[PDB]
Amino acid sequence: NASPLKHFVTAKKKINGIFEQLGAYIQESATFLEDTYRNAELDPVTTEEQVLDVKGYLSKVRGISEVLARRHMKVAFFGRTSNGKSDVINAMLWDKVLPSGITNCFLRVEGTDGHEAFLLTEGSEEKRSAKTVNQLAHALHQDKQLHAGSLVSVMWPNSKCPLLKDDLVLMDSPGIDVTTELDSWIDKFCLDADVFVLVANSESTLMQTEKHFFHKVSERLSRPNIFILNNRWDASASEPEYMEEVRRQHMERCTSFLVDELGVVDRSQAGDRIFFVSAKEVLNARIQKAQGMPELAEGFQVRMFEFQNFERRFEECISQSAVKTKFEQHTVRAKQIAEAVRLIMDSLHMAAREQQVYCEEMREERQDRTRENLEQEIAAMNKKIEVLDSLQSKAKLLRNKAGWLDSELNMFTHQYLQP
Ligand SMILES: [Ca+2]
Ligand SMILES: [Ca+2]
């Protein structure tokens, strides 16, 4: 019964942990290199640039760790307001989080640990109370500096929703109409959206502007995850026969759109991207169930299960995709950084071994020469030789630790970053 979102949660913690270890390892390496480089008793076995490079990598790794700590899954919802996309988000969250059509901007729902909802617009990080959904709606309408290119974050309490605790963000978009100016949308707000949900009506033809947007999604993102939720499916409660016909036809239209028109999916998983739902039915049932209220429509259990099925296939989709797209570049960077430090330690090991061999040979030659200070001078070179030997041992250990991290990273890649 574990949410598939736990795959993301698990991978995020695992990659953050590796970067913690990578940072610790580079720190130890930097400390070792610096100490070595400052050793005025030896001919140089490392260089300032190697020290600076490894301090530089430490900085970069800590910087990346900060990005990795904040990475989250994002699903973005699109479509006409009248088709109910906001109710789909509300149903998924088991509550009336977003106002539902009678909202200018993008609404980005994020979990907060605080026990009260509030808004954060983004050009100004200034909040607005959102004690109720009506007061939320009025707070957006009150704010006339808002438009369909503004994003407000709806900070919604963690405790109410496990989706939000598992680092899911849910973005509602402005409702689409014919002349909705939306070519800004993908670059400004959707580059990090792991899933795009089109919420449509099974019987209403898709607007050209809606199709145009999902063309742009398919042109701008690499293998974007597109779901089509065909809302108001509860009409099947009273016209099951006609809605079954509608289902077959629209299932085929949506498949052709996803597979042939957009080319973002095979036919084999079309049934996993195209769902027929009744969001407000689900949301109503969930609001009552959350309170222990009892309860109805014909086909209701079937429609509730379909929505739950959508949710599960969505959570599997977003969790697996987001892990891949949001961690793969940093996993690759981490391997490159590990390899850079590995090779410096190998360079140091080798220069220390070469200088050791040199000092051993200087020791043998010293024993061919005058007996004045011979034992003192052989001892000083014995000590240098033993430092060079310890440096080699230390560098080999650090080099093998870099290989360990490469191995952790390879295994993370294998488990979490497959196509
Ligand atoms: Ca360099
Ligand atoms: Ca030897």
Judge if 395 and 260 occupy the same domain: no
d(CA 359, CA 367): 12
Helix (H) or strand (E) holding 112: strand 106-112
Phi, psi of 191 (to 5 degrees): -65, -30
Task: Tell me the CA distances in angstroms from 26 to 30, 94, 247, 338, one per residue in order.
Answer: 6, 45, 57, 8
Judge if 201 and 339 occupy the same domain: no
What separation in Å is there between the alpha carbon of 332 and the centre of ligand 1? Answer: 19
Q: Of 326, 344, 369, which residue sits at a domain end?
A: 326
Contact 152, 121 (CB under 8 A): yes
Helix, strand, coil percentages (3-state) for the chain, rounded to 5, are 60, 10, 25
Method: X-ray
Helix (H) or strand (E) holding 231: strand 225-231
Which among 160, 106, 170 is positioned nearest to 318, based on CA atoms?
170
The ligand whose atoms approach the alpha carbon of 55 most closely is 1
Q: Residue 384's domain spans which residues?
A: 5-71+327-419
What separation in Å is there between the alpha carbon of 357 and the centre of ligand 2? Answer: 6
- Ramachandran area for residue 85 (φ above 0: left; ψ -120 to 50: alpha; else beta): alpha
Tally the domains of the chain: 2
What separation in Å is there between the alpha carbon of 347 and the centre of ligand 2? Answer: 19
Judge if 245 and 300 occupy the same domain: yes
The ligand whose atoms approach the alpha carbon of 388 most closely is 2
What separation in Å is there between the alpha carbon of 340 and the centre of ligand 1? Answer: 10
What separation in Å is there between the alpha carbon of 48 and the centre of ligand 1? Answer: 9
Contact 84, 39 (CB under 8 A): no
Judge if 297 and 352 occupy the same domain: no
The ligand whose atoms approach the alpha carbon of 358 most closely is 2
Judge if 167 and 262 occupy the same domain: yes
Residue 396's Cβ-side half-sphere holds a number of Cα atoms within 13 Å equal to: 9
Contact 255, 267 (CB under 8 A): yes
Greatest CA separation found in the chain? 111
What separation in Å is there between the alpha carbon of 209 and the centre of ligand 1? Answer: 50
Judge if 54 and 186 occupy the same domain: no
The ligand whose atoms approach the alpha carbon of 385 most closely is 2
What separation in Å is there between the alpha carbon of 345 and the centre of ligand 2? Answer: 20
**195-201: strand order across its sheet:** 127-129, 118-121, 151-157, 106-112, 168-172, 73-78, 195-201, 225-231, 274-276
d(CA 229, CA 84): 10
Q: Of 326, 344, 363, which residue sits at a domain end?
A: 326
d(CA 404, CA 408): 6
Residue 340's Cβ-side half-sphere holds a number of Cα atoms within 13 Å equal to: 21
> Residues 251-280, buried b or exposed e (16+ Cβ, 10 A)?
bebbbebbbeebebbeeeebebbbbbbbbb
Which among 238, 419, 218, 417 is positioned nearest to 331, based on CA atoms?
417
d(CA 403, CA 341): 10
The ligand whose atoms approach the alpha carbon of 343 most closely is 1
What separation in Å is there between the alpha carbon of 383 and the centre of ligand 2? Answer: 14
DSSP per residue over 29-93, as a string?
HHHHHHHHHT-TTS--SS-HHHHHHHHHHHHHHHHHHHHHHH--EEEEEES-GGGTHHHHHHHHH
d(CA 131, CA 144): 20
Residues 6+ apart with CB under 8 A from 82: 101, 175
What separation in Å is there between the alpha carbon of 212 and the centre of ligand 2? Answer: 73
Contact 110, 164 (CB under 8 A): yes
d(CA 337, CA 387): 27
Phi, psi of 266 (to 5 degrees): -80, 165
What separation in Å is there between the alpha carbon of 364 and the centre of ligand 2? Answer: 11
What separation in Å is there between the alpha carbon of 380 and the centre of ligand 2? Answer: 17
d(CA 132, CA 120): 15
- What residues form DSSP beta bridges with 106? 151
Q: Of 326, 354, 378, which residue sits at a domain end?
A: 326
| Residue for token pair 């698990």 | 10
Task: Tell me the CA distances in angstroms from 127 to 33, 49, 136, 143, 369, one per residue in order.
Answer: 48, 47, 11, 12, 83
d(CA 134, CA 141): 10
The gap from C-alpha 346 to its chain's centroid, in whole angstroms, comes to 34
Residues 6+ apart with CB under 8 A from 52: none
Judge if 397 and 302 occupy the same domain: no
Would you tell me how many other CB atoms lie within 10 Å of the CB of residue 327?
Answer: 25
d(CA 124, CA 122): 5
- What residues form DSSP beta bridges with 169? 74
Residues across the chain: 419
Strands 118-121 and 168-172: unpaired
The ligand whose atoms approach the alpha carbon of 48 most closely is 1
Judge if 163 and 229 occupy the same domain: yes
The ligand whose atoms approach the alpha carbon of 57 most closely is 1
Which among 1, 198, 193, 10 is positioned nearest to 88, based on CA atoms?
198
Judge if 112 and 233 occupy the same domain: yes
The ligand whose atoms approach the alpha carbon of 54 most closely is 1
Judge if 252 and 138 occupy the same domain: yes
What separation in Å is there between the alpha carbon of 53 and the centre of ligand 1? Answer: 5
Judge if 49 and 80 occupy the same domain: no
What are the structure tokens assigned to 167, written together? 């680092």
Would you tell me how many other CB atoms lie within 10 Å of the CB of residue 105?
Answer: 20
SS3 223: coil
What separation in Å is there between the alpha carbon of 27 and the centre of ligand 2? Answer: 31
d(CA 166, CA 323): 13
Going by the DSSP 8-state scheme, the letter that residue 179 receives in this structure is: T
What are the structure tokens assigned to 334, written together? 């981490």
Judge if 307 and 404 occupy the same domain: no
Going by the DSSP 8-state scheme, the letter that residue 224 receives in this structure is: -
d(CA 53, CA 73): 33
What separation in Å is there between the alpha carbon of 27 and the centre of ligand 1? Answer: 17
Task: Tell me the CA distances in angstroms from 254 to 88, 182, 242, one per residue in order.
Answer: 18, 22, 18
Which among 182, 116, 117, 184 is positioned nearest to 152, based on CA atoms?
117
